[PDB]
Amino acid sequence: MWDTSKDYRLLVAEKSVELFIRTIEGAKFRGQWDKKRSIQLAKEMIPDIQALRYSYIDPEELVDTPQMKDLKEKAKGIIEALGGEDWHHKFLSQASREDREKVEEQVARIKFFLNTILNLDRRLKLGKINDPVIAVDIVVGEVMSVGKHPSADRLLVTNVNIGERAVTVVTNDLTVKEGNRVAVALLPPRNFFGIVSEGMFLGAGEGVLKNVKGEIGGLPKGIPLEALNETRNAVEAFLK
What we know:
Elements: H1 8-25, H2 35-53, H3 59-62, H4 66-82, H5 87-93, H6 99-118, H7 120-124, E1 138-148, E2 156-161, E3 166-171, E4 181-185, E5 190-192, E6 195-197, E7 200-201, E8 203-204, E9 207-208, H8 229-239
Antiparallel strand pairs: 1-2, 1-4, 2-3, 4-7, 5-6, 8-9
Helix pairs in contact: 1-2, 1-6, 2-4, 5-6
C-alpha cells in the first residue's frame, strides 16, 4: 500500500496553500482584486488535499480523481480572482517605491503556489517514489544575466530563462555566467535582503551545475545524484 499521508508531493501541496493564504492575508485589500474570493478558493483546496493524503491509493491513481480535478479548478478560479492570466503584472503595478520588494515577494510566493497545485498531477504521475526532491519542479534554464548582490558580499544575482517564465535566482556560486545551462529547483521563494529569489540551482560541493543537459523549461538530464541533496534539505525545511 502507498502511504499517501507521508507523500512529500502532497505535503508540499498542503503547505503551499497555507503559504498562499498567509501571503494574500498580508496583502493590501484593493478594489481591483478579490482578496476574499482568493482566500475562500484556497481554503476549499484543503479538504481536497486531505482527502488525497488519507486515501492510501497509489499516486498514479490519484491523478484521475475528482479531488485532483477540483484542485486544478480552484487554482484557475484563484487566477481569475487575482485579475486573470496577467495578475502578476497588476500586483507589481501597485508597487513603485519600496512597494516593489514587498509585492515581488508576494508575487513570487503566489507563483510558487499556483505551479505547485497546477502541476501536482505531473509529480504524482511519477508514481511510487517518495523523495522530497520530486515534490517541486526542477527545470532546465539558461542564465541570461548575472551581477553581484548589491548588499551581500558572497552572493550573486542571476536572471534565468526557464521557457515560459524568467526567474531571479540568488546563488553562492560566484562563477555562474551568462549562457550557463542550469537546473532550477522551483522552491519557496527567499528574499535575500530585497532581492527575491524564485528558486535554487542544482549543485554539489564544487558549485552550481553549469552544463545541464535538456531543453529550456524541460526536465534536466544526467544530473549527478549528489546535486540533489540541497534541494531535498530545502523541501524538508519548508515542510518544517
